[PDB]
RNA sequence: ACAGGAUAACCGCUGAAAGCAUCUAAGCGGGAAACCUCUUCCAAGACCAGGCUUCUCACCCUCUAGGAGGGAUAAGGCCCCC
RNA sequence: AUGGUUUGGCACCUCGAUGUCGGCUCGUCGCAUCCUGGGGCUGGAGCAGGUCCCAAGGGUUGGGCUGUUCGCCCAUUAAAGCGGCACGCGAGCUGGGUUUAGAACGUCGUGAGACAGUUCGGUCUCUAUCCGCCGCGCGCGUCAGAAGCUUGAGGAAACCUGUC
RNA sequence: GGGGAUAAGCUCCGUGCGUCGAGAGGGAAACAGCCCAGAUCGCCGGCUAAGGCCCCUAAGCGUGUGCUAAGUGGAAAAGGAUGUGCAGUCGCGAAGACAACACUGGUCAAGUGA
């Protein structure tokens, strides 16, 4: 029959993804197949058999139109009147990380799946990051021509 | 900002120099040590951490009265951590330096943070001053009770229903200290500050005035 | 798919390249072979490459 | 798109350095700093002049690039010879004068009136009602002008107040 | 409340396409009880379940020695009591 | 052209039950802004307005008459906004009106009787299962067991105004 | 086609018109009546229909030539409007065209107007 991972099977690796002047979809979409397994021939939908991903530069990320002033992020708490909006400029310059983060997250399953993936996703404004201990591989976004 | 801890004492009358009266509320700032620097460096945030009371030293258990060793100071009741903005205001406090109730002036204009009284369990009219609906005209047992709750079907969040009320930090702004009284380590400050006799409050300088 | 992507080459452009070469091997073998030896899947990666033609986009 | 393709002079006597985009140019009067768009390069002519040089036809290019040569034609002019505005009032009772660095009025409001003097201008008045200001960047003295023409309504019925030359 | 930031209507500065002009398509400023901070309070079940410290920092038995189970303790806590 | 806030039209929904108006109590939302805030032209001299853009943070009174909504009036006020939400809210209250049985007047009917005509009187049931909401605990978790002091992602509250 | 205000998820007729009723499966997010297609049962085989191929989600961040700056795409009218692409005309013009400094003269320098 059809093969299936056992206990033992998943291994992962580390992958490390430069932000710089990179459009925020295309690096969104790239991360969550990396984080999704999708790459791996033994991927399997029950699993989570994907690889760690680790973004810097992320405050450098490039966002085309005008949707720096123009395209919101909405929250609300609950309570009447509790929706807070704010434009991916502020944003930006408060939290850089969320921004990529949310795109990232809203790109993979919703369902619990979804949920213990997100935790192998690590984001950081600065160029650098705590995780040289791993010895992530740098990963490139590349397209197979066809 | 300056800051002490200190207890609530009491209410009393006061007479100032156009012989018009003050009601002032007696706190006794007694004396306070500093056991603990917070800097950004360390901890992120520019704090300094006050020490009052008097206890037993049989009453500490272990972990604080290493704390304290730790900090070179004997064991007090209370702790308590002032934030400050930034690090130059921070270097004036060192450990085991004693602040006393003379860091206030007579006018200056405090904050005081204390822990209201227990109120129990109440209800919307006293919890939330809800007017009542009528004692007669026909009104059948609905002399108190809050009356209709208010599409989608639900109780919105923030209800203002029945509850426990009472036993919350509060601070009153813009008190104005009356007389600063160095022998007692008394502050007389004009106007009341919550909590009841005997509670701990803190006393700032007022953020505003 | 992602053992063909894992030899630069789309599933479609694959599978028609397959197709051509005269190959019939289906899809649950061919699984079964990216997932247990990829050698051989390599090797048919090739041969659909060789029978693909020069320009895909002709008419 | 015209008037960017004609190279502006630059004196034998100012210093012009060009780091890509970055240009920062070194004269008598003073020195400013001046970054071009990234769709025009610009090179320093070696005939004594600088190249404004458009490598696009299309609108975004076209369009910026004459306000690029005017941009750079302005900096070489308020870096040699500086900007000079010159100011003035009418009515009565209106007086002006100069109080150090500081611009003091008394337009007739209840309360003094100051104005602050930024870097990069100097105020002079030689009369209580006319008045100058002078600077070596010209949006800067424009700004400050509009500023000080600022401190009194327009009058239709009267004109009192200030207005410009 | 004071103060700061980004703004609305609006007032502007510097100017192209369009040799002039144009608060504008490049840019730069002012501008409100609205917005973000600022004031007060809750808040790490914030599952990214945080931080700074301080205290205890060890003793058995069983199955089979792989792991587990059981017992007795320290710092400390709770019950009973006022 | 908008809206389904007004009367409508359809009868898709319920007759083995979906309470009918006002009022009280408690809300929440919109801005098509009544006051307060920023503006502009004035057929704006100043005062004061006219009209218009932005602006929903807070506020927006007490009485007489009527069951009333509506409305008129009396005093004020900075102002006494317009609307949605089963024309919000009766397992929250009222029963004055409407809408059973008693009785009378006018009118219609030979008569029993009748009148989107009037008048007086006239039972408003329930121990909260689930969701929701306000409070309070128990268990477990946060990679040894504990204890002090805390950062705060994220939320909640507050925001009025006059006279001199 | 009639009635109604050619308004209704209004009502009434005709149709070798369809589907549902009595019809699963795939698509349209969900969706009796729309589109594809009529389920005898099993298969861890293959080709296709409608619809699709960045991720959710199987298959194209396909190839070539152009357009769009409005997130148009991803709701709507009378009407209003120096947006822009293409094509067609005409007016004026190196005898120097337009601008700049009603109609005329000098500088200037190619396009300038509907």
Same mark, same amino acid.
């Given at each position: 029959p059809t093969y299936t991972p056992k206990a033992g099977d998943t291994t992962r690796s580390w992958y490390v993804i430069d932000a710089s002047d990179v459009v925020l979809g295309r690096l969104a979409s790239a991360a969550a197949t990396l984080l999704r397994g999708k790459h791996k021939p033994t991927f399997t939908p029950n699993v989570d058999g994907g690889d760690f991903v680790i973004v810097i530069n992320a405050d450098k990320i490039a966002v085309s139109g005008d949707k720096l002033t123009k395209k919101f992020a909405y929250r609300h708490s609950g309570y009447p009147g509790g929706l807070r909006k704010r434009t991916i400029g502020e944003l930006l310059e408060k939290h850089p990380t969320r921004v990529v983060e949310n795109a990232i997250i809203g790109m993979l399953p919703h369902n619990?799946?979804?949920?213990?993936?997100?935790?192998?996703?690590?984001?950081?404004?600065?160029?650098?990051?705590?995780?040289?201990?791993?010895?992530?591989?740098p990963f490139e976004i590349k397209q197979v021509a066809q | 900002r300056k800051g002490i801890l200190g207890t609530k004492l009491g209410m009393t009358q006061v007479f100032d120099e156009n012989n018009k009266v003050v009601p002032v509320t007696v706190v006794k700032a007694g004396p306070n040590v500093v056991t603990r620097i917070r800097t950004t460096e360390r901890?992120?945030?520019?704090?300094?951490?006050?020490?009052?009371?008097?206890?037993?030293?049989?009453?500490?258990?272990?972990?604080?009265?290493?704390? +304290?060793?730790?900090?070179?100071?004997?064991?007090?009741?209370?702790?308590?951590?002032?934030?400050?903005?930034?690090?130059?205001?921070?270097?004036?406090?060192?450990?085991?330096?004693?602040? %006393?109730?003379?860091? +206030?002036?007579?006018?200056?204009?405090?904050?005081? %943070?204390?822990? /209201?009284?227990?109120?129990g369990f109440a209800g919307t009219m006293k919890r939330h001053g809800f007017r009542g609906?009528?004692?007669?005209?026909?009104?059948?047992?609905?002399?108190?009770?809050?009356?209709s709750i208010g599409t989608p079907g639900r109780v919105f969040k923030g209800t203002r229903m029945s509850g426990r009320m009472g036993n919350d930090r509060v601070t009153t702004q813009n008190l104005k200290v009356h007389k600063v009284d160095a022998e007692n380590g008394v502050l007389l400050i004009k106007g009341a500050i919550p909590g009841r006799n005997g509670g701990l409050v803190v006393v700032r300088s007022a953020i505003k005035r | 798919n992602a053992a063909a992507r894992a030899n630069d080459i789309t599933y479609n452009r694959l599978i028609q390249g397959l197709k051509a070469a005269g190959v019939e091997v289906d899809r649950k073998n061919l699984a079964e072979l990216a997932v247990s030896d990829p050698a051989a899947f390599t090797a048919l990666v090739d041969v659909a490459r060789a029978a693909l033609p020069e320009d895909v986009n002709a008419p | 798109?015209?008037?960017?393709?004609?190279?502006?002079?630059?004196?034998?006597?100012?210093?012009?350095?060009?780091?890509?985009?970055?240009?920062?140019?070194?004269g008598p009067?003073?020195?400013?700093?001046?970054?071009?768009?990234?769709?025009?390069?610009?090179?320093?002519?070696?005939?004594?002049?600088?190249?404004?040089?458009?490598?696009?036809?299309?609108?975004?290019?076209?369009?910026?690039?004459?306000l690029s040569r005017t941009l750079i034609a302005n900096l070489v002019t308020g870096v040699t010879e500086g900007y000079t505005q010159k100011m003035e009032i009418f009515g009565v009772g209106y007086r002006v004068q100069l109080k150090g660095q500081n611009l003091e009025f008394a337009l007739?409001?209840?309360?003094?009136?100051?104005?602050?003097?930024?870097?990069?201008?100097? +105020?002079?008045?030689?009369?209580? %009602?006319? +008045? /100058?200001?002078?600077?070596?960047?010209?949006?800067?003295?424009?700004?400050?002008?509009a500023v000080i023409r600022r401190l009194r309504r327009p009058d239709p019925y009267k004109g009192k107040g200030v207005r410009y030359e």
């Open positions: 619990k799946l979804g949920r213990q993936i997100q935790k192998k996703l690590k984001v950081y404004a600065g160029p650098d990051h705590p995780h040289a201990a791993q010895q992530p591989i | 901890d992120g945030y520019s704090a300094v951490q006050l020490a009052y009371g008097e206890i037993s030293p049989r009453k500490v258990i272990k972990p604080v009265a290493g704390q +304290f060793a730790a900090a070179g100071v004997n064991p007090r009741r209370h702790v308590a951590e002032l934030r400050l903005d930034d690090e130059a205001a921070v270097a004036e406090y060192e450990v085991g330096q004693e602040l %006393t109730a003379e860091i +206030f002036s007579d006018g200056a204009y405090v904050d005081v %943070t204390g822990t /209201s009284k227990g109120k609906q009528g004692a007669a005209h026909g009104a059948q047992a609905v002399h108190r009770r809050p009356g | - | 798109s015209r008037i960017g393709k004609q190279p502006v002079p630059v004196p034998s006597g100012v210093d012009v350095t060009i780091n890509g985009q970055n240009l920062s140019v070194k009067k003073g020195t400013l700093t001046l970054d071009v768009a990234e769709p025009i390069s610009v090179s320093r002519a070696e005939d004594g002049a600088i190249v404004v040089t458009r490598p696009d036809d299309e609108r975004r290019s076209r369009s910026l690039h004459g007739g409001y209840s309360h003094p009136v100051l104005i602050e003097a930024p870097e990069g201008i100097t +105020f002079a008045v030689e009369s209580p %009602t006319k +008045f /100058s200001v002078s600077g070596i960047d010209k949006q800067k003295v424009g700004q400050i002008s």
